Design a protein around this ligand. Structure first.
Ligand SMILES: COc1ccc(C(=O)N2C[C@@H](C)N(C(=O)c3ccc(OC)cc3F)[C@H](C)C2)c(F)c1
Ligand SMILES: [Zn+2]
Length: 1422
């Protein structure tokens, strides 16, 4: 492994690993922020004599193309010149292994062949920061024993060096004779001239062309001081002073020469323009363009008489082109031929030929477009996060808050609609608080009523997810918007509808020679064959539910769809693009037609499912410049053609071994995709799109991160990002295919391997990284069908991939079975080989170089610890002994071209400096990690509040979180945001690097609070309630003993190790019982199959359950709120609907809850938030459990009581005083008298589960809806409306257990008496009818087809007969899959589903009692 130093003339050294030719070379060190097209880039004649620092950290993914191949024009087929032009190459990471269809060899092999030196392993960002604003930074790549001095190659005539020595002819025989003056021309200049009918005579830089016959002249170049080419400047002068009026087109060096030849001056830029994201402005008509540039010399803006500036630089105000006021002479300083770079300025070549074809001294202005208008708005309605749709059900989207922010800045009055009263969106108090907020459902009735009342003239319907969109679309289509005179701001509804309907899209896109491949939903075999026939084979059939799924010909489609129609009514026929590269683009377009790509994402792995899961990386890694720029160009034409004014998302499928692509879809509303893109790049889409909808153009909006630059640009990422979904599963397995993606993680690295391993760890705390060793120490089965495990969906898929590599299955086979591009599989194999290396080493034999490298590819100290036989603490010690630590970098949007001084931060081992100072010494606030079941959006409310409490008292903050769906991860609302792991390791690194004053672990759910003790032992000041007490409060055995000592009752329990131990307890307290590794037991057999140390709690039936949410100070309760669950106490608990204040709890029970709490608070010395759960039966109060942290009910409680508990808690924790007089202390509570509050989940759905001692249908739930009402019954009906449901009125499906009949009959009659028609299955229906309760028989979904007297439930729900299902736990194992299906039908149809008898009762009573009655602008909130 040979090594070398890059040394700079300022003293700086960095050691690196040679992958080039192993020899020294000296030169000018430059940087370039263009991410793509390194093979094209390093053949740019412009780099002659220059050592190129690549901004992109991952170089060599595509190998090298065929470097000997010529086109029929005799130019290099794939390069921009005859060979490599850089003197040397500096990169962070070099891909040894490569994967492109055009690749013929490694980039290392190509560089050695060309005699060019290249070192990897150096900090290209530190270099950039050093080179930036320093005129000419000289340096050398030096190998030991090969010294070389510093030399400036720019003091010799580099134009001469790269210029053709003799005249060459290209496109011999064409009609239009173009003399091209070679000052370092790029091949694409030649290629684009010839394509437009030119015969191109390429002449030496000092050739005498003043007398040649020609139709047009072109001067194109790259390297060197334009001043040293004096002979050429003279020859141009002589043209200009002659009467020749043949069109003259200068590119880059052309601009410099042409300018010098007319009497202008050139300077060496102290800050050069080298990038693919360089913004220019056409002075003459105020149009903006994104350009590739590569020059460190510029033309002074004091031009001489006759000449005017044409293009100017938007970032730095330097000259970017010039024009003759009369004659057809012009120049651009940028490269319109790009290659690499954006294909946005090619029209300048058309312009050129037009100036030949006119030939009457026409001007440059004459053959382009000409000058042009914005909406006046006084009050905008913003539809916020809504309910669920009959399709894309399950989205959070609190980006309206950024929209509100945008509006306020333009003095636009704002009205926000969000039905959740405890929403993080409406928990803002500054520029992001709306002027007026309505807590109403997002439906046409309610938005119409808000319109009548508020009389807005603006609407934003594209920043509240799908439900909001459909609502404002519908409102447009009833003329409601036109009637009250409300504009749609941004993309129009016509445009939006064309994106939302597939057929309409397929038409609009056919208007510009773009094709979709229409998907067809079909109910028969012959219509499947018809659809297939229209699409063209191969094709994909997808069932609604659930090999995958593919038909190359009509034979197969029939066989497969025939199977499919024997289990369902409808299938979807689509074009098969499976195994193609999925790439997406985020695009922005303003009302002045400026258009920019902000981010791009490559799906790594779809995980064997459909959805919008997808392991994703940004930027894309495996595309060539050609492939990237084609798709970009296509995005921009589609987006222009749709008239997008705002953000768009456009997903492509790209054939993996060709340039064939197709457009999968377009979303002209904000999405998951667009949120990821904002956090990945630093570019605030939602905020910018809001400004755009007022009609403000991008160059007039500020780049919030940079400060100095505009939002009219394309970000440049000097890191890579990885995003992994968090699924709703909770166990690690190898069958089911309708899992929902309930959350996601994002991780930032400067190698793929670092990013990827962090992403893995963020996903779930018991995922160590990428290994073949399964979590929980489980072992691989010996019946293991490894091909299967790689093709079917599973929750240990990544482990299986790891195993397949480790078991020497080829990567080609893995690529074929997973569809994961082999480039990703190479990097994954590199991780597994490091682990093998490590396993053979120990604390002594392991070298600094091996450890450094392991950390640089994402190994945790824990992973290393398992290999070396150390513990984690010992491994950390070992590492710090060697001074191996990570580095704090900024995301700055521009790859360090301009410095950011906002603090959006990440931590990487691939660096040599930090990018910030550590003088703040602020208060750390740990975030919650990815949303999952149990842990939803409420802990984001808690974050915003705690952070705010610290901000408002002037305390410097440090925020840490890795959930990209969180409002709290906003660099504008804390001082330092680290977008980072919430592991012990990474939090120790940040806490100690910063020297944080303390750390708050209380306000982020379970992840940060489990770190209490480990943090405590590793030197962290944990604010509030001591981690020693947290350990005590959450050791069952210790907490139970404290409770006997305090004389506070609890249900008896016992940890057991044996079956006879278990059975003897259950006996001793009567059945039934509970379980853990929460599971139920009624009889001896469940117990029998689980451990093959289990905790056994006595179950109390018919019990109420109570949350006590509180704040302690020095052990005294200083705020509290008691809330009652609707549902009887049971295993379901963290998805219980809550009622505040209590409804059916004896007064003595309350006093006992209060007293128990006072005691618990004192026993554990609580100073901070905390929660306690209780069983209450009559007057018996039993404590269930105590969590020494904020609960999910904290926002609810706070917004109900008019007191921010998290704010009270934060103050207590930092020692700020808090006046107790108006807080809800135990002696003076706050009980609402005129209103009740309900907290319910936003979305709920069935899961078929899983361990299978019994097949069990469960409900799962996420999100929050919370409402006030006069009493609980109206609040519950408002909740129902607020989750997007219609209040039931026609009919009710009744599914109950046979044994539950006596207890249900009352409710059933009650429901029939309110005018509901009852449906049930035949046994139930009969029995209801038998008791004089009318009911219609229906059929179990299994038995559909076998009894035509009985209507199917799907028909009665399509009908509209059934608009509420009641489906209570049915332990009968025969009908479990049926009850799963009934539930599933209800949820996907969008009719309300009730699964608990108390919720059922609460509904029945509610309809008896009783949609614009219940809200009717009535007032609340104390
Ligand atoms: C190529 O990148 C990949 C592909 C698959 C996976 C993968 O196998 N999973 C599987 C699994 C760990 N996962 C989960 O959300 C998940 C997390 C925890 C859990 O049990 C507590 C179950 C899960 F499904 C994700 C879907 C990711 C991955 F982590 C990375
Ligand atoms: Zn420039």
């Amino acid at each position: 492994a040979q090594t070398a130093h890059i040394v700079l003339e300022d003293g700086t050294k960095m050691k690196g690993y040679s992958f080039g030719h192993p020899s020294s070379v000296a030169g000018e060190v430059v940087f370039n922020t263009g991410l793509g097209g390194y093979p094209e880039a390093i053949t740019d004649p412009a780099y002659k004599g220059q050592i190129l620092t690549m901004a992109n950290p991952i170089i060599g993914n595509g190998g090298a193309p065929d470097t000997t191949a010529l086109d029929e024009l005799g130019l290099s087929k794939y390069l921009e010149s005859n060979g490599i032009k850089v003197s040397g190459l500096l990169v962070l990471d070099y891909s040894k292994d490569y994967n492109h269809w055009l690749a013929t060899k490694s980039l290392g092999q190509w560089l050695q062949e060309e005699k060019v030196p290249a070192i990897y392993g150096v900090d290209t960002r530190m270099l950039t920061k050093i080179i930036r604003d320093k005129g000419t930074m000289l340096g050398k790549i030096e190998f030991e024993g090969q010294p070389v001095d510093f030399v400036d190659p720019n003091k010799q005539n580099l134009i001469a060096e790269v210029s053709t020595k003799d005249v060459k002819v290209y496109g011999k025989g064409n009609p239009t004779k173009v003399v091209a003056v070679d000052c370092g021309i790029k091949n694409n200049v030649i290629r684009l001239l010839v394509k437009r009918g030119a015969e191109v005579h390429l002449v030496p830089w000092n050739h005498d062309f003043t007398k040649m016959e020609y139709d047009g002249i072109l001067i194109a170049g790259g390297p060197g001081n334009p001043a040293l080419a004096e002979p050429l400047i003279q020859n141009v002068r002589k043209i200009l002073e002659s009467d020749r009026k043949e069109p003259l087109f200068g590119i880059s060096t052309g601009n410099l020469i042409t300018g010098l030849a007319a009497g202008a001056k050139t300077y060496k830029m102290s800050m050069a323009n080298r990038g693919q994201n360089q913004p220019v402005l056409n002075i003459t008509n105020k149009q903006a363009f994104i350009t590739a540039q590569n020059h460190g010399y510029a033309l002074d803006n004091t031009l001489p008489a006759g000449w005017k500036p044409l293009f100017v630089n938007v970032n730095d105000q330097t000259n970017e082109g010039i024009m003759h006021e009369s004659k057809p002479f012009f120049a651009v300083q940028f490269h319109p031929e790009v290659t690499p770079g954006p294909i946005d300025t090619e029209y300048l070549f058309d312009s050129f030929f037009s100036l030949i074809k006119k030939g009457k001294a026409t001007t440059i202005t004459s053959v382009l477009p000409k000058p042009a208008s914005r909406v006046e708005v006084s009050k905008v309605l913003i539809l916020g996060s809504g309910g669920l749709s009959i399709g894309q059900a399950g989205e959070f989207d609190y980006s309206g808050s950024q929209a509100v922010k945008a509006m306020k800045e333009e003095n636009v009055k704002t009205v926000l609609m969000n039905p959740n009263i405890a929403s993080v969106q409406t928990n803002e108090v500054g520029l992001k608080q709306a002027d007026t907020v309505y807590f109403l459902p997002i439906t046409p009735q309610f938005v119409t009523e808000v319109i009548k009342a508020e009389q807005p003239d603006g609407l934003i319907l594209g920043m509240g997810g799908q439900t909001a969109l459909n609502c404002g679309v519908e409102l447009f289509k009833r003329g409601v918007l036109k009637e009250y005179g409300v504009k749609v701001l941004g993309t129009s509804v016509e445009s939006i509808m064309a994106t939302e309907d597939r057929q309409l899209f397929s038409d609009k896109l056919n208007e510009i020679n773009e094709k979709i491949a229409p998907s067809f939903a079909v109910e028969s075999i012959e219509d499947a064959l018809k659809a297939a026939d229209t699409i063209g084979y191969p094709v994909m059939i997808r069932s609604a539910y659930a090999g995958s799924g593919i038909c190359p010909n009509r034979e197969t489609l029939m066989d497969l769809s025939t199977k499919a129609f024997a289990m369902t009514n409808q299938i979807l026929v689509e074009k098969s693009v499976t195994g193609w590269k999925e790439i997406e683009y985020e695009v922005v377009r303003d009302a002045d037609d400026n258009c920019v790509t902000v981010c791009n994402m490559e799906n790594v792995d779809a995980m064997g499912v459909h959805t919008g899961d997808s392991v994703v990386v940004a930027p894309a890694q495996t595309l060539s410049n050609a492939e990237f720029q084609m798709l970009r160009r296509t995005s921009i034409n589609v987006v222009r053609h749709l008239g997008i004014v705002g953000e768009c998302n456009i997903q492509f499928a790209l054939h993996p071994t060709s340039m064939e692509y197709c457009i999968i879809e377009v979303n002209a509303r904000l999405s998951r995709s667009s949120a990821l893109a904002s956090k990945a790049t630093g570019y605030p889409l939602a905020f910018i799109a809001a400004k755009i909808a007022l009609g403000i153009p991008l160059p007039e909006i500020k780049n919030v991160v940079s400060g100095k630059t505009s939002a009219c640009f394309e970000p440049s990422l000097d890191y890579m990002v990885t995003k992994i979904p968090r699924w709703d599963l909770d166990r690690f397995h190898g069958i089911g295919s309708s899992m929902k993606s309930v959350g996601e993680v994002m991780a930032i690295g400067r190698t793929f391997e670092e990013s990827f391993q962090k992403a893995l760890r963020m996903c779930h705390p018991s995922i160590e990284g990428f290994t073949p060793r399964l979590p929980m120490n489980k072992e691989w089965p010996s019946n293991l069908d490894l091909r299967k495990e790689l093709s079917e969906p599973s929750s240990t898929r990544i482990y299986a991939i790891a195993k397949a590599i480790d078991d020497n299955m080829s990567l080609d086979e893995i690529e074929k079975l997973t569809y994961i591009d082999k480039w990703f599989l190479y990097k994954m194999r590199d991780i597994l080989n490091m682990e093998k290396t490590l396993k053979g080493l120990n604390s002594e034999s392991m070298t600094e170089e091996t450890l450094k490298r392991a950390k640089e590819i994402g190994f945790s100290d824990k992973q290393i610890s398992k290999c070396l036989g150390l513990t984690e603490a010992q491994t950390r010690e070992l590492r710090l002994k060697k001074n191996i630590h990570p580095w704090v970098k900024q995301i700055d949007t521009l790859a360090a071209e301009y410095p950011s001084v906002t603090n959006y931060l990440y931590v990487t081992y691939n660096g040599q400096e930090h990018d910030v100072n550590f003088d703040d010494h602020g208060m750390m606030v740990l975030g919650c990690g990815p949303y999952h079941i149990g842990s939803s959006v409420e802990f984001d409310w808690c974050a915003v509040s705690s952070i705010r409490t610290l901000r408002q008292l002037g305390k410097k903050t440090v925020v840490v979180n890795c959930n990209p769906e969180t409002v709290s991860t906003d660099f504008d609302e804390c001082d330092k945001l680290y977008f980072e792991e919430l592991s012990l390791e990474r939090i120790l690194d940040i806490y100690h690097q910063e020297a944080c004053g303390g750390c708050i672990i209380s306000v982020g759910g379970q992840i940060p609070n489990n770190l209490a003790v480990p943090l405590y032992k590793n030197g962290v000041k944990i604010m509030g309630t001591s981690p020693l007490q947290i350990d005590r409060a959450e050791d069952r055995s210790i907490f139970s003993a404290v409770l006997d000592e305090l004389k506070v009752a609890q249900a008896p329990w016992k940890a057991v190790n044996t079956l006879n131990e278990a059975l003897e307890f259950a006996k001793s307290v009567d059945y039934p019982c509970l379980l853990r590794p929460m599971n139920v037991v009624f009889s001896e057999d469940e117990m029998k199959k689980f451990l093959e140390p289990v905790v056994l709690t006595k179950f109390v039936e018919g019990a109420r359950e109570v949350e006590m949410d509180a704040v302690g100070k020095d052990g005294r309760v200083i705020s509290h709120a008691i809330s009652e669950h609707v549902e009887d106490a049971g295993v379901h608990s963290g998805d219980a609907t809550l009622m505040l204040p209590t409804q059916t709890i004896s007064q003595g029970a309350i006093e006992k809850v209060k007293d128990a709490t006072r005691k618990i608070a004192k026993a554990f010395a609580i100073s901070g938030p905390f929660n306690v759960q209780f069983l209450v039966k009559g007057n018996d109060v039993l404590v269930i459990e105590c969590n020494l942290r904020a609960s999910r009910s904290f926002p609810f409680v706070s917004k109900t009581l008019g007191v921010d508990f998290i704010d009270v808690a934060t103050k207590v924790m930092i020692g700020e005083n808090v006046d107790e007089k108006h807080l809800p202390t135990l002696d003076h509570p706050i009980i609402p008298a005129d209103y009740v509050a309900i907290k319910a989940p936003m979305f709920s759905w069935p899961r078929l589960r899983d361990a299978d001692p019994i097949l069990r249908c469960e409900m799962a739930s996420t999100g929050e809806v919370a409402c006030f009402g006069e009493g609980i019954h109206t609040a519950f009906l408002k909740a129902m409306l607020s989750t997007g449901f219609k209040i039931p009125q026609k009919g009710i499906l009744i599914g109950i257990q046979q044994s539950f009949r006596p207890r249900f009959l009352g409710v059933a009659e009650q429901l029939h008496n309110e005018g509901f028609k009852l449906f049930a299955t035949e046994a139930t229906s009969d029995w209801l009818n038998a008791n004089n309760v009318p009911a219609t028989p229906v059929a179990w979904p299994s038995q559909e087809g076998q009894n035509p007297s009985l209507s199917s439930i799907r028909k009665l729900i399509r009908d509209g007969s059934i608009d509420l299902v009641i489906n209570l736990p049915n332990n009968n194992t025969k009908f479990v899959h049926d009850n799963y299906v009934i539930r599933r039908t209800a949820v996907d149809s969008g009719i309300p589903l009730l699964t608990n008898f108390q919720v059922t009762k609460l509904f029945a009573e509610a309809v008896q009692k009783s949609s614009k009655s219940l809200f009717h602008y009535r007032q609340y909130s104390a």
